[PDB]
Design a protein around this ligand. Structure first.
Ligand SMILES: */C(=C\C(=O)Nc1ccc2nc(NCCCCCN(C)C)nc(NCCCCCCN(C)C)c2c1)CN(C)C
Length: 212
């Protein structure tokens, strides 16, 4: 069937859609198609390109209320790489508290982690019941399942600025230095190339966690 309304969705609404690049982009919902219990959502992107998407591959063009975000919520979040802004899918790992300066911790589908504000989040429209089940990277998927279902039990390493450890990157270990701690993240400086990364303190990419 061709629908105009489906739950809280309405044809003609502004929406975010996931492209083949894995980045998300503004568009308009132009059709809703059902095949039995299955539902697909046709999006016309602002560049006039069209794609037929599953409901976990569209997100609302508004920010979720705080009381609708939980550990395990499926979101699109802003990631600023340099002066470029991308919208990328992830999982809420932490909700605002004193220790994180009232921010949301996001674990992105590509393994990166960041603290963001509510204004940097968009809810995915039709997430899977087990929200991690559409994470393509199996390693990341398994990590998320374990994290979300064990929460609030979260093994983490205790580090401070100046400590020297090895940190994993693309399957090898690198000499590194702890630059900064911010809540559940540590900023690691890779000594070989002097590039840095915020890494979750429970990541086995950190030597002490790997060795624990
Ligand atoms: C460190 C500063 C510094 O290095 N800053 C910095 C700026 C931008 C960076 N961008 C990226 N991008 C990678 C892709 C991200 C995709 C995110 N998704 C869309 C959600 N990565 C940066 N760093 C990652 C770590 C690289 C380590 C390389 C290791 N090497 C030995 C091979 C990144 C960093 C502090 N200064 C030096 C004082």
């Amino acid at each position: 069937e061709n629908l105009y309304f489906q739950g809280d969705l309405i044809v003609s609404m502004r929406i975010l859609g996931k492209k083949r690049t894995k980045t998300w982009h503004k568009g308009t919902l132009i059709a809703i198609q059902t095949v039995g219990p299955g539902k697909k959502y046709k999006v016309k992107f602002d560049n006039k390109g069209k794609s037929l998407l599953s409901g976990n591959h569209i997100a609302y063009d508004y920010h979720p209320p705080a009381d609708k975000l939980y550990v395990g919520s499926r979101v699109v979040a802003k990631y600023k790489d340099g002066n470029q802004v991308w919208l990328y899918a992830g999982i809420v790992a932490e909700t605002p508290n004193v220790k994180n300066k009232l921010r949301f911790l996001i674990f992105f589908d590509d393994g990166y982690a960041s603290y963001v504000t509510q204004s940097e989040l968009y809810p995915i429209c039709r997430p899977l019941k087990k929200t991690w089940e559409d994470i393509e990277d199996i390693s990341c998927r398994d990590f998320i399942e374990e994290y979300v279902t064990a929460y609030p039990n979260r093994p983490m390493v205790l580090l401070k600025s100046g400590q020297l450890i090895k940190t994993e990157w693309e399957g090898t270990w690198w000499k590194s230095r702890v630059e900064e701690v911010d809540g559940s993240l540590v900023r690691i400086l890779f000594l070989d190339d002097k590039r840095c990364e915020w890494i979750y303190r429970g990541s086995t990419r950190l030597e002490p966690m790997f060795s624990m």
